[PDB]
Each structure stands twice: as structure tokens, then as C-alpha cells.
């Protein structure tokens, strides 16, 4: 969800039913304008909110002009003051393999491995996993230059109605056609394609990481995505599929 079109995106009307209050909405317009000011980002997308147990973890990401770098994501508790999260790696994301469940409130909560595991590093590494596995990009929004710098397509139309239902018309928003298609998915059928308001909306609801919502209309220019959910991976998915 883009910062300049947060009110111009059907969040509560997307069908997931996990949106924002007017308090959180006005806080996101003012605070995402603030993190567009002091952090020199080309464009800032509201990533989503993690529900937590005692407090909500509002997550937003910012991007440079290269458009394929790892995201300098940001977090907030009262949805007003935002600060940068440390960059993530594989060895640091390995560390929470012995713990599971929801995570609550302040980043200073220590988890038992006994190595004390911080809440903040678990949060940003989980953000990296949800970015890597799910939160797809639409087709035609990312065109390729001969150099390594990728630009967002200003001439993006970019999905016909015959290609809305197909899996192959969505790529993973991850540096790796351009990117890995959604038919390279395990298990087969881990995305719920659903028709709301006729042809005026489609949702690609992720089932490996619920409740991630991918935001159309066709003929547009949004081209957005939002994850609001419990925060942990759905390892239960092939049983229910």
C-alpha cells in the first residue's frame, strides 16, 4: 500500500477485514510523510501491521531508486514514531528455529533459546521471511534495463482480465522473465484468488502467510499489498489444502 494512496486503496473493503482505524490511518499519512522526509526514500509503502499479543506492530518499508535492494523497513508501536530496523541475514534468522508463537509489545522482550533472543531481531527476520516467500509483485510493473538498476513502470497498465485468474501473471517481489513466477510454489495452490465486486477487484490471499492481501483493481495503478496477520508461518497448510 503506497503512502500517497492509503485513502485511495480499499483496505477494509478488500475482504480480509483487517484494516485500520481513522487514528491509525491519519497517523500513517503524517508519519509516512515524515519517514519520506528524514529517510531519503524514492517511495514508501505501508507494509502492514502485525497484531501481536499485547500491542500492535505496525510495519512500513522504504525503497531507493534501485528498486530491487533489500528494504530498509521501519516499525512503530503507537503508529506515530518510526525508527529503522537492523538489516537481516540468514544466520540471524536461523536463531529463532527453537521458538514459536506470537510476539508481544516492546522490542526488549527476551526469549529463551540459554541465549536471550530479542523481540526486535525476531520481528525484522520474520519481516524478511514474509517479504521473501509472499507479497508478490504484479506483472508488467517491473520492467528490465540492461544495467542492474530497475525502474518502476510508469506505463504499467498491465494485467488483462483474461490473465487475472492465472498464477503465472504474478511474480515474487524478490531479487533472484524478470522474477520467479507464482507457479514455482510449494504447495500447489497456496494462494486464494477471489473475485470481489465483479471485475473491479481481485485478491491474491496468501495461505502460507495469512492474512496477506494483494491489492488490485485492473486498469490501475494500485498495485499494492498488505500483510495483517498473526505473524508466524502456516506450517499447517498442506493438511488444509
Amino acid at each position: 500500500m503506497d503512502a500517497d494512496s492509503l485513502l485511495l486503496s480499499l483496505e477494509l473493503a478488500s475482504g480480509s477485514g483487517q484494516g485500520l482505524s481513522p487514528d491509525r490511518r491519519a497517523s500513517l499519512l503524517t508519519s509516512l510523510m515524515l519517514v519520506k522526509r528524514d529517510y531519503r526514500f524514492a517511495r514508501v509503502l505501508f507494509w502492514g501491521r502485525i497484531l501481536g499479543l499485547v500491542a500492535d506492530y505496525y510495519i512500513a518499508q522504504g525503497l531507493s531508486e534501485d528498486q530491487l535492494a533489500p528494504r530498509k523497513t521501519l516499525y512503530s508501536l503507537n503508529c506515530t514514531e518510526w525508527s529503522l530496523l537492523p538489516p537481516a541475514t540468514e544466520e540471524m534468522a536461523m536463531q529463532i528455529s527453537v521458538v514459536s508463537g506470537r510476539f508481544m509489545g516492546d522490542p526488549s522482550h527476551e526469549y529463551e533459546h540459554v541465549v536471550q533472543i530479542k523481540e526486535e531481531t525476531r520481528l525484522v527476520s520474520i519481516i524478511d521471511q514474509i517479504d521473501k516467500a509472499v507479497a508478490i509483485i504484479p506483472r508488467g510493473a517491473l520492467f528490465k534495463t540492461p544495467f542492474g538498476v530497475t525502474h518502476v513502470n510508469r506505463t504499467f497498465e498491465g494485467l488483462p482480465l483474461s490473465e487475472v485468474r492465472k498464477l503465472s501473471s504474478y511474480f515474487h517481489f524478490r531479487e533472484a522473465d524478470f522474477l520467479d513466477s507464482l507457479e514455482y510454489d510449494i504447495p500447489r495452490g497456496s494462494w486464494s484468488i477471489q473475485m470481489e465486486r465483479g471485475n473491479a477487484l481481485v485478491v491474491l490471499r496468501s495461505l502460507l502467510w495469512p492474512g496477506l492481501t494483494f491489492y488490485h483493481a485492473p486498469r490501475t495503478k494500485n498495485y499494492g499489498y498488505i500483510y495483517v496477520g498473526t505473524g508466524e508461518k502456516n506450517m499447517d497448510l498442506p493438511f488444509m489444502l
Partner: protein, 51 residues
């Protein structure tokens, strides 16, 4: 004919002093921006890609 091919290639290769670029590289960059997978209605926008 191949002589007409060479004459038309020399005509397209001729540069302009008011812009610094020729017609051949301009149409090559236009075709580069065309040949990425846009939906097939680029007939109205072939001008706007040239601007």
C-alpha cells in the same frame, strides 16, 4: 534491393544537429521500450514513448 537497403540505412544513420541523435538509434530505443511486455495497444502511445 540491397543497394536500396544500404541507401535507406545511410539515410536512417544521418544525424541531426538540432538534437544530436539520429533516427536509427531513436527508433532503436523506442523499440527497446516497446518490446518489453506491454499490453497490445501501443499504437496510440508510440508517439508518447518517443517524447
Amino acid at each position: 534491393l540491397e543497394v536500396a537497403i544500404q541507401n535507406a540505412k545511410a539515410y536512417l544513420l544521418s544525424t541531426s544537429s538540432k538534437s544530436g541523435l539520429n533516427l536509427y538509434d531513436h527508433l532503436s530505443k523506442v523499440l527497446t521500450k516497446i518490446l518489453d511486455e506491454r499490453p497490445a495497444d501501443a499504437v496510440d502511445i508510440i508517439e508518447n514513448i518517443s517524447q
